[PDB]
Amino acid sequence: NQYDNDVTVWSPQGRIHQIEYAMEAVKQGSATVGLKSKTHAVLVALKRAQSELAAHQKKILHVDNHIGISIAGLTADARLLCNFMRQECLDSRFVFDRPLPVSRLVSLIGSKTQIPTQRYGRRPYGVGLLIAGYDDMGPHIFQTCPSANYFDCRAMSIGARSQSARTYLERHMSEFMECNLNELVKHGLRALRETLPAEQDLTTKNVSIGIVGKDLEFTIYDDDDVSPFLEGLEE
Amino acid sequence: TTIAGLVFQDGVILGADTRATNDSVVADKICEKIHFIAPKIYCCGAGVAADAEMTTRMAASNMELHALSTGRECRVATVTRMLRQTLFRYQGYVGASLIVGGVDFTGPQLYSVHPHGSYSRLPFTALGSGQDAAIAVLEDRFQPNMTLEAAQELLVEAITAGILGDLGSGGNVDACVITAAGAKMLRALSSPTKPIERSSQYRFAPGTTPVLSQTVVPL
Amino acid sequence: MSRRYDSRTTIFSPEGRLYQVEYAMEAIGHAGTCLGILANDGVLLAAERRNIHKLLDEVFFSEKIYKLNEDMACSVAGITSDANVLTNELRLIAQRYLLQYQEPIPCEQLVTALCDIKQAYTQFGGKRPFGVSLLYIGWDKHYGFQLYQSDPSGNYGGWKATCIGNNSAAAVSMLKQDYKEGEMTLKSALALAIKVLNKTMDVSKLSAEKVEIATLTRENGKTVIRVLKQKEVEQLIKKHEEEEAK
Amino acid sequence: SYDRAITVFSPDGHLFQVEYAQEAVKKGSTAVGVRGKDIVVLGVEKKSVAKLQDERTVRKICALDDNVCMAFAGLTADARIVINRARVECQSHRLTVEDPVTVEYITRYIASLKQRYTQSNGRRPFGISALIVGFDFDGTPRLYQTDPSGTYHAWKANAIGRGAKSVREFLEKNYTDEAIETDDLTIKLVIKALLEVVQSGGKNIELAVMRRDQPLKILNPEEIEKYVAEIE
Amino acid sequence: SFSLTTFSPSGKLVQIEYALAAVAGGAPSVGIKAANGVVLATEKKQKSILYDERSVHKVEPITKHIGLVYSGMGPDYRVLVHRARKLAQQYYLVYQEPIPTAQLVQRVASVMQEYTQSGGVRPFGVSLLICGWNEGRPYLFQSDPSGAYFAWKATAMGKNYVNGKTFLEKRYNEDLELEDAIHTAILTLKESFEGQMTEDNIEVGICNEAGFRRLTPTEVKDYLAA
Amino acid sequence: SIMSYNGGAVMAMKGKNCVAIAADRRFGIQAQMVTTDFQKIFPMGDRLYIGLAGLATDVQTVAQRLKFRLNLYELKEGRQIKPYTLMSMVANLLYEKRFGPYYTEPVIAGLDPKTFKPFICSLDLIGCPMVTDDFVVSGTCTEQMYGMCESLWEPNMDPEHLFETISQAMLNAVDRDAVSGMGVIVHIIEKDKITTRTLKARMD
Amino acid sequence: TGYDLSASTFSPDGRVFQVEYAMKAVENSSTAIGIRCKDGVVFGVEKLVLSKLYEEGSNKRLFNVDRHVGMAVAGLLADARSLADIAREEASNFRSNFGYNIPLKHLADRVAMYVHAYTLYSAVRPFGCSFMLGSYSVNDGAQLYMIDPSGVSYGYWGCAIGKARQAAKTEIEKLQMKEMTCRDVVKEVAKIIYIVHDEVKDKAFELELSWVGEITNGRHEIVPKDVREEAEKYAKESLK
Amino acid sequence: TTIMAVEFDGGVVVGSDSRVSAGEAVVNRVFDKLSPLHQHIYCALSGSAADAQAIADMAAYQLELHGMELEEPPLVLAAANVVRNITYKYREDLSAHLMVAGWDQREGGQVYGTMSGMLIRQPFAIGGSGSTYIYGYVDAAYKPGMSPEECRRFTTNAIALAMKRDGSSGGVIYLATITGAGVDHRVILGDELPRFYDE
Amino acid sequence: FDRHITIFSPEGRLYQVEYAFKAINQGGLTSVAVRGKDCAVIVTQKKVPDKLLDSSTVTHLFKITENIGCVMTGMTADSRSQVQRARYEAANWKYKYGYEIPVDMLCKRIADISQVYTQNAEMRPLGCCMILIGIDEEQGPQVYKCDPAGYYCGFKATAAGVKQTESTSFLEKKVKKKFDWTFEQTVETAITCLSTVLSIDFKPSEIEVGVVTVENPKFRILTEAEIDAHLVALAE
């Protein structure tokens, strides 16, 4: 009714509906999934094309050698945080000559996300961010929210039709830690199967992935190297 | 330029001479020095001419604002914290030198302000170019809590010793007598120069000037 | 903040006009009746005083008539508060002109300078517009004797004769009928103001105290402005007093 | 300060504020202009004053420079700000570049202002549409029309203000190579372009002309009647 | 950051129209300019006998020769005291002379004009009577919430000003002594104010050749003989 | 210094009810002379004048800001400014720019706008107001102008004496100066009118 | 009525509804409790398990403001993480100025200044979380204060916040917490949370405890895994 | 220009000289250089007299605003930091040098040299152009664990020795002693100054 | 519309300011203060909802400066805000004018801060009334009360809260008798006032009593042990 106009107005139940609808816009778009083992972490992003003539949108944004992120939500809203996140990672190596820790970066990104919220007139960021990274303590999977909340997860699936995907992730979570880089991609791609209906399932064309590891810097694969990753797996 | 001040039992008195000079010649014979702030508080400046003038007038307006706003009469210790914070902000670049004193409900208080912004409380002081000549008589001949009329003639001897001593002190000598009951100003208090006359009388009749053009503007 | 209470003057009506400006012209019509006449020998200005009471004083030179500068003057009908704002801004623009060119500002230049400031608030800023309508008189080196009328929307224009405030439709109609273009001068045309001010005022027996008259004429290379003597204006009304009988 | 958006979108996509701005453009007086062969001619109707106004301030045909002049139809308020700040650009362009001003260069900077005023916070779109016309290098004339929205076009013959579409119907039908052949036929076309929207107006038509190297020249009322005398 | 004052369909200013409506709902105030001085009489009404009278005064001086009274919202008048006093000191800096009455009220009313224009600020709910003495000419001015200051030989405001003006249409004559003008203003407020009439409730002050001087309750008690 | 760059001088005196002002017309650059037609004295309106000397730029600059702020005071109040009040304006104007000071030595003389009452004064390069009821001299020849004035000055003299007095003052004084001379403008301020004469001096 | 549309608008009954809604937003948060005793101040937090996919230690509600100052929050999590950095930058500016650790009474007062500053205007909103600030020092001892959406400091011997509040506050009043020692406080803090939460809507949870006091040598420190599970086993005696 | 501070068990002792000298001609020969930062906290001015007085009031303000918020006197370490943070900030345009000493209900008597804008903790500190010649006397005479009277002995004698050699130091001594009880004041007149070897 | 923000009502009122007057009244605490000959006393209701709450952690008596005490009644959110802002002023007063701020100017500056809340529509009035006490060398004991509207005046006996209407009546009954002004016997009058209104006989921890005297210009808070002495032992 009259409580949905802006962020500052609180509902009589103590809820901000603009932040609530900010989480709704994240469910309105492509579903991405990511997971981490004791060594390697993989981010599986689902690329979607509006038509067959138009190509697939880019859901992966390269951050640094040790850090990468996938975006689910309003498309262009991630561009502002992208150039900011890249600038923060460069400033870390520009001063400390050291890559910024993964947990410290997300804490700084969650700060810039929360600042415009309480201040009237500034629109909250309506895109969700699934970011991964590797450090001396191993890989990390950090899922964020438009409310600026961010967690630490072994595996997480966000977006539309992520219900059956999360159920698959929970039962197989015990394997996600002990599997090697090859098996992480396999079960990671089969987790993306539940995010789409029974007609269109998965192809190497519309599905891209990225990986980070112990001695391996974050890389991005789209079609060529992804074809042997998908094939050889039962669904 | 030499100004002086002193503290007596019931109040303070600030002495000054009348002569202002452009550091080569005498600019004015009768030029006044002592300024006005409050009914119970008057001040006198020294050092740079205009820097002392504007500084006292800018502080005198804030005293009237504080007076009427509080409904209470002005305080003497309040004056200095206005002055120095304005002068110290300029870091002594302003050559204004001020000897400030007055009477409040607490009692007689006589301060002094150097161009760098320093302040000190004391019964008597003198500043200016010829200060050291006038400070001598003041430091030597002062007694604690002297009689009012005894301190008046003491100030007359003070600046008089600074007149012959310095090339910047001359003309007449006036003082400002401020008391706990009220304030008073004495003009033409000391007239050391008696030779103001003219020997030869010269009356130049019209026509001795080679007139060229003439025009008149009516009103 | 509370956009609920924001009137947004910059919004156009569905008829393609401004809300505040349209209501500003009506507020001017409620003000007193003021007229002006541009003649050969100079400019003529007369203004009614709608304030009538036995306790009034008016220690100033005039109520609705002000002096802009040496060579120019003005009248006012509208909100009395916003008039002092425009009067000060006219005195600022005219004197800042004297800095650069060291010459008196022409009549047309000073008028168009404030009208840009008037409508600047209707263009942006969110602040309410001005409800003041001003008449302009004076002399310049080129165009000479000039008479100008301004509008709250910022629009203006030259006028040989005009009227502002109450009774605008009746006065201007009565003005044109007997108005002599480039012919009837101060002396004669001064009788028209008294004749018009008596018709515009609904209360009969027009009083010299209820009206005010000021003229500006440059003579012998010097601009002369004065407020006419009420004792003489009474005799100037005594003329109109004997006009209906003879 | 005052910071908020003024012009916002609609469920059908059209702009409420901008359409009401162009509505006030049509509510103004009818102004016309054409691009002649060797010259340019502007004209605008005059609402008939009764034995009062002075024509110095009322004149709606101005000149931004010796090369380029302009006319406007709409609210007289916003017209004077554009004329002033465009003349500043004309002198600023000559200050920056020794070469004279270009009609296309000055025109775009004008309409660009109205685009800024539309998308700026707290500003307002103007209710004016101006015809920018002048001479380019080698003597090639150019006629451009502005828009409150900030776009600008090129026109061989143009009409603005009230009944702009009505006169445009007379334009497109009666504009041929026979039009704007000579300085006389160019002026007579501007008069006839003002004869459709005129109701018992008569002498109210005022005209202006710019001839080659010379700057904008105002035709005297008797010189106007000379070309108006021929109708039938 | 937006001005809430807009033009009514009749042309009136709605925010300022209700500004004077708050002024008329306050304590009555009157003034008279006669002979060599100007008198200002106000009525101070407390809510009980537990409030100190001499603590806060309605009549306040601005400069030596100028003083002001008010009827309306109390706190809104305290803002004008600081701005009027500070303006007079900025005057004394430039011209080194006491401020005239006409110059003061002009720029003081300009503060009223600014807050009826600049956004995010409500107009004032006060109306002030201006008393000043300059170059042998008595000055009695009346200011409103809109910022329009007029000239009055005598005036009434606050509550029951209609009956107050009626008294000034008769009781006020010319060549009237300042002392008789004070008792005349008391007769004007005789009908308005009811209950117990004391010297503490009424607050009177004057300005003359000697300057603006506020009257003490002891002196007022002698002026209550009528 | 820069005060001696353009040279020039301004002199003003007071009679009984009247005051007098005179100044040299010379305008030049250092040793080189340019033109003798320069005007160092500007009218301030009825019964008031102001002189200026020193750097010729600030003479044509500061004096232009006068009538700027003067008219604003003459438009708001329906009276002319007092010469005692005008002195505070110039002293305040020089102390807004005090930090990088203008170069000039103002001279103010006139009458009480109220009636006949005369008043005179002068200011300083740094803006210090100085009230002297006898005479004021300013310029590069200053030290030479003193002895002439103080010897021939008298408290009360009719306009007839003030004619020859300040004339003979200027003449012999300005002689010994290299950078001042070549024409003199004299202004005499009476109650009901104003007398302005031109003096014949050596061209040198 | 439209009187609740803004915090700058007062109710005709003289109330502020927007700030009251922020307190109702805290009522949606999970239950968190804290207790102070002679040895130090003991913290506890109920950590709800939304899904098994969360890593151990994720959704940490224990924030470290400074060396001697810990904090536990109940409300919107990001609003607490944003203010946590504000408190850290504030305590850092204190030591950079006066050269020592800010006391709890001084820090909780300046944070309340920032909390209430957002309740004053219409251009911002109040914090949707109510938090507790503990501290320990040899100069003071165990100290515990509480800040609310209105930005007011409340000292407590023991306290409860979150959804279930009044029920946990009464259980704390039934036993004197000042005589007991931090070693025995974590036993009761664990027993209370088991009594507070039952399985109706939420499924499972875990106990998050924090230590500040003499046992931690005057430094904010999380509970070790060995002692935490030991205190939970003693708390499982009430469950069995 | 001579200032001195000595630490002992219950508190500290701060001496000063009354001569304010600029050039070879004394400006003001009688002045009290002790400027209170607070009831229980004082400072010792040195260097340029005018520039040092401004820092004292700017410090006494920032300290007073922080004092009433906690309703307790700030730590002596907090006083030296405020003096240092103000000094080091403006130290390029201010040649003033200060000496901070005080007592608190926790640490006790402390002395922190702020000279030039640095910070140091010393049992005794000296400063000014007159203290340049007392480095020899302070080492042999000073011994720890002296009573306030025994400290004032070592304090007054070192200052009475200072003002003899220095031309810019002279006048009378102003003493301040802050203990748990309160503040004490002693003024040593020129004739009351202990006299040393003049030959 | 006029009932929400601060704008002039058609009757001349201000509803945003008046709804604040009900907000001070909404706090559920009644405060009284009486100005005596040699002293000024403040007695307010000290409420402790739960035993887990602590005494010294919640107090209604604040110190603006050493010689000026402050008591607050309303929603505590606005209580602490003004006191910090007042301490930014009273301290600033000494940095400029160099002496302890008088009670006259302290109430004037705090009012001006509250006057901007009413004039500026961006901000809101504060929901706590402020009663400032102190002493000066001329007028002696000073007692003022500043409303959120910005008005303040010298009050011989002032009251606030829900019982303010009944509290003012009993304060009039004591002054109507020309009650002899002495220090502790006046402290009774302020305590007996709240005691007779609510008909309770409060415990020593249920009230908070501040004091200021000519002998002690520094503000003091009466000890709860001394409160018990003058409640039980002297009810007379």
UniProtKB/Swiss-Prot annotation, chain B:
The modification Phosphoserine is found at S191. Autocleaved. The resulting N-terminal Thr residue of the mature subunit is responsible for the nucleophile proteolytic activity. It comes from the Eukaryota. The active site is at T1. One of its GO terms (biological process) is cell morphogenesis. Its EC number is 3.4.25.1. Keywords: Acetylation, Cytoplasm, Hydrolase, Nucleus, Phosphoprotein, Protease, Proteasome, Threonine protease, Zymogen. It catalyses: Cleavage of peptide bonds with very broad specificity. Induction: Up-regulated by interferon gamma (at protein level). GO terms for molecular function: endopeptidase activity; threonine-type endopeptidase activity. Its main location: cytoplasm. GO terms for cellular component: cytosol; nucleus; proteasome core complex; proteasome core complex, beta-subunit complex; spermatoproteasome complex. It is found in: Cytoplasm; Nucleus. The proteasome is a multicatalytic proteinase complex which is characterized by its ability to cleave peptides with Arg, Phe, Tyr, Leu, and Glu adjacent to the leaving group at neutral or slightly basic pH. The proteasome has an ATP-dependent proteolytic activity. This subunit is involved in antigen processing to generate class I binding peptides. Belongs to the peptidase T1B family. This is Proteasome subunit beta type-10. It comes from Bos taurus.
Swiss-Prot record, chain F:
One of its GO terms (cellular component) is nucleus. PROSITE patterns: PROTEASOME_BETA_1, PROTEASOME_BETA_2. The modification N-acetylserine is found at S1. InterPro entries: Ntn_hydrolases_N, Proteasome_beta_3, Proteasome_bsu_CS, Proteasome_sua/b, Proteasome_suB-type. It is found in: Cytoplasm; Nucleus. GO terms for biological process: proteasome-mediated ubiquitin-dependent protein catabolic process. Keywords: Acetylation, Cytoplasm, Nucleus, Proteasome. The modification N6-acetyllysine is found at K76. The keyword Electron transport does not apply. The keyword S-adenosyl-L-methionine does not apply. Non-catalytic component of the 20S core proteasome complex involved in the proteolytic degradation of most intracellular proteins. This complex plays numerous essential roles within the cell by associating with different regulatory particles. Associated with two 19S regulatory particles, forms the 26S proteasome and thus participates in the ATP-dependent degradation of ubiquitinated proteins. The 26S proteasome consists of a 20S proteasome core and two 19S regulatory subunits. The 20S proteasome core is a barrel-shaped complex made of 28 subunits that are arranged in four stacked rings. The two outer rings are each formed by seven alpha subunits, and the two inner rings are formed by seven beta subunits. The proteolytic activity is exerted by three beta-subunits PSMB5, PSMB6 and PSMB7. Belongs to the peptidase T1B family. This is Proteasome subunit beta type-3. It comes from Bos taurus. The lineage of its organism: Eukaryota, Metazoa, Chordata, Craniata, Vertebrata.
UniProtKB/Swiss-Prot annotation, chain H:
Pfam families: Proteasome. SUPFAM superfamilies: N-terminal nucleophile aminohydrolases (Ntn hydrolases). Induction: Up-regulated by interferon gamma (at protein level). Keywords: Acetylation, Cytoplasm, Hydrolase, Immunity, Nucleus, Protease, Proteasome, Threonine protease, Zymogen. One of its GO terms (biological process) is proteasome-mediated ubiquitin-dependent protein catabolic process. Its EC number is 3.4.25.1. CDD domains: proteasome_beta_type_6 (cd03762). Autocleaved. The resulting N-terminal Thr residue of the mature subunit is responsible for the nucleophile proteolytic activity. The modification N6-acetyllysine is found at K33, K89. GO terms for molecular function: endopeptidase activity; threonine-type endopeptidase activity. Encoded in the MHC class II region. The 26S proteasome consists of a 20S proteasome core and two 19S regulatory subunits. The 20S proteasome core is composed of 28 subunits that are arranged in four stacked rings, resulting in a barrel-shaped structure. The two end rings are each formed by seven alpha subunits, and the two central rings are each formed by seven beta subunits. The catalytic chamber with the active sites is on the inside of the barrel. Component of the immunoproteasome, where it displaces the equivalent housekeeping subunit PSMB6. This is Proteasome subunit beta type-9. It comes from Bos taurus (Bovine).
UniProtKB/Swiss-Prot annotation, chain I:
Pfam families: Proteasome, Proteasome_A_N. InterPro entries: Ntn_hydrolases_N, Proteasome_alpha, Proteasome_alpha-type, Proteasome_asu_N, Proteasome_sua/b, Proteasome_subunit_alpha6. The modification Phosphoserine is found at S9, S55, S56. Keywords: Acetylation, Cytoplasm, Glycoprotein, Nucleus, Phosphoprotein, Proteasome. One of its GO terms (cellular component) is cytosol. SUPFAM superfamilies: N-terminal nucleophile aminohydrolases (Ntn hydrolases). It is found in: Cytoplasm; Nucleus. It comes from the Eukaryota. The modification N6-acetyllysine is found at K94, K96. Gene3D superfamilies: Glutamine Phosphoribosylpyrophosphate, subunit 1, domain 1 (3.60.20.10). The modification Phosphotyrosine is found at Y151. Its main location: cytoplasm. GO terms for biological process: proteasome-mediated ubiquitin-dependent protein catabolic process. PROSITE patterns: PROTEASOME_ALPHA_1, PROTEASOME_ALPHA_2. The 26S proteasome consists of a 20S proteasome core and two 19S regulatory subunits. The 20S proteasome core is a barrel-shaped complex made of 28 subunits that are arranged in four stacked rings. The two outer rings are each formed by seven alpha subunits, and the two inner rings are formed by seven beta subunits. The proteolytic activity is exerted by three beta-subunits PSMB5, PSMB6 and PSMB7. Interacts with ALKBH4. Belongs to the peptidase T1A family. This is Proteasome subunit alpha type-6.
